């Protein structure tokens, strides 16, 4: 079934990313899996694509810089790009290109610090202060500006 | 109001993180803001805490390694930890400790590759293949295992 193929895709892609990252080095998300046949599929597609992939490196760096993907907009961009990739048809090479785009997108967003986690922690902090009465306390002490007296004088 | 204090908290925390990361270096999310008074508050709290914070570095590294926070569980852990921090009362120092925990948590999750973005892209890939008929195509070509013939022979 295609639910089975979808399940297998997780192992294929994770193995693909693991082995592609190795062959290009010289991203800790990409170094951390135990697989089998699907692991072999991902490995082989990464290996045999290496010469092709490297010739595209320069322009994908320029294009991804212009796109400015973030964790917030990555889903929207991924979907539009992947839909367009397959509009005129599916073949094995375009399927591998989808894995390669996932690789490049994950790497670019992580290494440019666009993963959004600090922004997520910022929302944690604000949300906690608002809903657990910390903001109330700071307001009654005179607001954040009152902290300017700490270490002052 | 405490909605105002909550809004100000975003600038305080982002400035706090920006300046703390500078003083400890020698995370690109932490290098990327334009503020004013709240920026000054965050800067000052990071600066005057430096000697105290560094004495806690060793044990927070051990504790965060044991906790194993990820983007998936960070909210749950943040909330439990922050609630416990203030259980016996609020004071300015504990408020600063909350900003410091947010800093440490964001840094640890990013640098250990626990930000979850590759896992998010993996879900993008699987979801697209399932809902945009790519998995159907691969199934009719014999499944992912059929890709083992690419580059073979």
């Amino acid at each position: 079934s295609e639910e089975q193929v979808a399940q297998d895709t997780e192992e294929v892609f994770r193995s693909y990313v693991f082995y592609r990252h190795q062959q290009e080095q010289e991203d800790p998300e990409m170094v951390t899996q135990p697989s089998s046949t699907m692991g072999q599929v991902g490995r082989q597609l990464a290996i045999i694509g290496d010469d092709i992939n490297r010739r595209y490196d320069s322009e994908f760096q320029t294009m991804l810089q212009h796109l400015q993907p973030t964790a917030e907009n990555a889903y929207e961009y991924f979907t539009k790009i992947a839909t367009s990739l397959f509009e005129s048809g599916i073949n094995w090479g375009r399927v591998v290109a989808l894995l390669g785009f996932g690789y490049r997108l994950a790497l670019h967003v992580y290494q440019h610090g666009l993963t959004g986690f600090l922004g997520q922690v910022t929302r944690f902090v604000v949300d906690f202060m608002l809903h657990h009465s910390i903001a109330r306390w700071i307001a009654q002490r005179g607001g954040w500006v009152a902290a300017l007296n700490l270490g002052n004088g | 109001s405490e909605e105002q204090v909550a809004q100000d908290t975003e600038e305080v925390f982002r400035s706090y993180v920006f300046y703390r990361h500078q003083q400890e270096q020698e995370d690109p999310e932490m290098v990327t803001q334009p503020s004013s008074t709240m920026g000054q508050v965050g800067r000052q709290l990071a600066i005057i805490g430096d000697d105290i914070n560094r004495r806690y570095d060793s044990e927070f590294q051990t504790m965060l390694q044991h906790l194993q926070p990820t983007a998936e569980n960070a909210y749950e852990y943040f909330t439990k930890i922050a609630t416990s921090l203030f259980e016996s009362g609020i004071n300015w120092g504990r408020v600063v400790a909350l900003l410091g925990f947010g800093y440490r948590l964001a840094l640890h999750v990013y640098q250990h590759g626990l930000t979850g973005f590759l896992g998010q892209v993996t879900r993008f890939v699987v979801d697209f293949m399932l809902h945009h008929s790519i998995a159907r195509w691969i199934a009719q070509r014999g499944g992912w295992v059929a890709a083992l013939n690419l580059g073979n022979g």
Partner: peptide, 25 residues
């Protein structure tokens, strides 16, 4: 000029078609 996401999709397709021509035998 072409939007970045349009250009990326065009080059992904080019790349994939090169892979396909290379290996789909």
């Amino acid at each position: 000029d072409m939007r970045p996401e349009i250009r990326i999709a065009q080059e992904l397709r080019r790349x994939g078609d090169e892979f396909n021509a290379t290996y789909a035998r």
